[PDB]
Design a protein around this ligand. Structure first.
Ligand SMILES: [Zn+2]
Ligand SMILES: [Zn+2]
Lengths: 193, 56
RNA sequence: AAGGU
């Protein structure tokens, strides 16, 4: 009785797409019956189909478990370092799904909204791994409401075709070295004044 | 001002950390274009339809 | 046109 109840962005909302409002990508895409509101101002950007997991390649089950971990760390390092040039990066999420709307999706949330707009203006004219980079603003705010809950513990029975984010987490050593390196880069660009 | 003091206390704290702008990326795949596309920009390649997304 | 409130 303290506040009115709403259904906006929920699965019960029959005009707004709940999956696009939370996860930033719907299985129907532009043919969906519900609205996909593309934000003009946002902190999170989306690079669809950027991470090509070698496991889903013809010659990509020849690598061992240790080699696969170092290859993903080289990708996560290559992403966080390049995205850091557009401002402060708060979180970097890489999707390990197989659905055409979430396969290899890369979400990056900046601290400032202007940092995200300057990123999509530059990424849409660059390349990565012999492929043009697609960049757009994503309405994703909280990744906890978009990640698969049954995937954090054990594995999701739906497999790679899950409509929620199956985020592939990097090594804790790299994630810690990236946060410490970003604060050092920001602290160095502060003693100038 | 204490702002300058709060920076020097962090820089001396982060003495054995390399800043992100000086990370030596050994195998970075950025700006690598496919053979023949040296004169084709990223915008012209997406509109050509040779590099479509898995949705389309 | 669903599993997510
Ligand atoms: Zn939708
Ligand atoms: Zn799942």
């Amino acid at each position: 009785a303290s506040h009115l109840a709403s259904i906006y962005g929920t699965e019960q909302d029959k005009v707004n797409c709940s999956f696009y409002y939370k996860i930033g990508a719907c299985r129907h895409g532009e043919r969906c019956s519900r609205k996909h509101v593309k934000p003009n101002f946002s902190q999170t950007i989306l690079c669809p189909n950027m991470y090509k997991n070698p496991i889903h390649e013809p010659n990509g089950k020849k690598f061992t478990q240790r080699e696969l971990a170092e290859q993903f760390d080289a990708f996560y390092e290559d992403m966080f370092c390049e995205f850091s040039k557009y401002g402060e990066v708060e979180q970097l999420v890489v999707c390990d799904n197989v659905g055409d709307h979430l396969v290899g999706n890369v979400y990056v949330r900046f601290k400032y909204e202007e940092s995200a707009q300057n990123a999509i203006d530059d990424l849409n004219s660059r390349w990565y791994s012999q492929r043009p980079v697609y960049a757009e603003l994503s309405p994703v705010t909280d990744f906890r409401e978009a990640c698969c809950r049954q995937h954090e513990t054990s594995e999701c029975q739906r497999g790679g075709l899950c409509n929620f984010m199956h985020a592939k987490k990097p090594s804790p050593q790299l994630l810690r070295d990236l946060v410490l390196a970003q604060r050092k880069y920001l602290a160095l660009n502060a003693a100038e004044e | 001002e204490r702002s300058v003091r709060s920076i020097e206390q962090e820089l001396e704290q982060l003495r054995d950390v390399t800043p992100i702008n000086q990370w030596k990326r050994k195998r970075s795949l950025w700006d690598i274009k496919p053979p023949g596309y040296e004169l084709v920009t990223a915008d012209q390649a997406k509109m050509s339809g040779v590099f479509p997304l898995p949705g389309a």
